[PDB]
Structure 1
């Protein structure tokens, strides 16, 4: 039945967002809840944000 086939390849570039699942290596799961702005994040006396 098949006369010819065209296979198309797309490339999606998905960045992280709330809902995406992350983890470490000790079975510590988690879901992103909010991308907090750099201005709002905690920072040490040195000044470098977490």
Structure 2
């Protein structure tokens, strides 16, 4: 009964509802990268292993 607990939601609200999302924000271009020594910048293409 911290789950089955209720709380007032002020005069104007009988009930409230929620959902949470595990958003798998994958590796992609336009996203940002860096290293420890102050190099900071955008991922500007993904290259085949030989395109390198």
Structure-2-length-normalised TM-score: 0.66
User: Which one has a larger percent helix, Structure 1 or Structure 2?
Assistant: 1
Structure 1 residue 35: Cα displacement: 0.3
Residue segments in structure 1 that go unaligned for 5+ positions in a row: 42-50
Residue segments in structure 2 that go unaligned for 5+ positions in a row: 1-11
**CA-atom RMSD in angstroms:** 1.1
Q: Distance in 2 between matches of 1:31 and 1:11?
A: 24
Structure 1 residue 8: Cα displacement: 0.5
Structure-1-length-normalised TM-score: 0.69
Structure 1 residue 17: Cα displacement: 1.1
User: Which one has a larger percent strand, Structure 1 or Structure 2?
Assistant: 2
